Amino acid sequence: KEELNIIQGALELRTKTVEDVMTPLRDCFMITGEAILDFNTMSEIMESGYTRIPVFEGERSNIVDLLFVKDLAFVDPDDCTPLKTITKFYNHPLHFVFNDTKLDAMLEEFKKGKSHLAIVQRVNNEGEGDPFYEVLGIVILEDVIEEIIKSE
Amino acid sequence: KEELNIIQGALELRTKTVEDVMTPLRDCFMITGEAILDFNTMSEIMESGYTRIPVFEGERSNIVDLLFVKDLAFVDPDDCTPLKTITKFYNHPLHFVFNDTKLDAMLEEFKKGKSHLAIVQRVNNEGEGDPFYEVLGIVILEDVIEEIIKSE
Secondary structure, three states, rough: HHHHHHHHHHHHOOOEEHHHHOEEHHHHHHHHEEOOEEEEHHHHHHHOOOOOOEEEEOOEEEEEEEEHHHHHHHOOOOEEEEEHHHHHOOOOOOEEEEEOOOOHHHHHHHOOOOEEEEEEEEEEEOOOOOEEEEEEEEEEEHHHHHHHHHHO | OHHHHHHHHHHHHOEEHHHHHOOOOHHHOOEOOOEEEOHHHHHHHHOOOOEEEEEEOOOOEEEEEEHHHHHHHOOOOOOOEEHHHHHHHOOOOOOOOOOOOOOHHHHHHHHOOOEEEEEEEEEEEOOOOOOEEEEEEEHHHHHHHHHHHOOO
16 A cells, blocks of 8 residues: 555665665756757747756756746747856755765755755765766655655 | 654545645636736746646636646747647646545555646535535645655
């Protein structure tokens, strides 16, 4: 029954990590900061079905901003407005989390906050020199909910 | 501990009904089928944050269609397109549900499908004539998610 799947999903929030349920970067729907909000761009955005779109610059691992489809409400597609312009105005916060972060805590961070999206990253000491932050993908609240209510 | 919050929330699925967690009609965000997708109407839709919007005709309790913001992707707001044009074309299915439906059952119906929205209605034995289905409001997947994960 569902009750069992949920409880089991709850217990596993202790062991499991954001890396276990995240959406790997290569599968993430992203957009470039050098984008122009013409009718076409905005069409491709509203068509994706996504509410939150990560904004990258140069590489996909260089997530620099967060686009909400809600931010395109007053954008006129005939102004051919740059995305930089909007992201500068709204400037929604970016939240980063580590790959080893447990799901029970991530959920807790998600609940206190309007943030339901976080960038999963890890530490790459595998240099070649200075260790740095490597982006792995993004995790959203729906990702942990699913690991709770799914059957297993 | 969220673990216990989730577990207890899961225990309450067998007792509580869709009527207990639904969004009552008076608080639902809707739109008339007589609408026109001019720039203003689009903005209002795109600003609510709602990804799914019920369509009513004449009376709010008379829900006849379902609008997805995905359906607005290729609409040019300068064309001033009837909402009927889009609802007729896409023709997204409507799902109804009874108020006495337990949540564990409602959760089950949401998983086995794409529909995460359902119109709650009850049986009106209070005629004045033949009985009928009376619309109470809408319930979505997130409504039962909240019930499970909310703090108590």
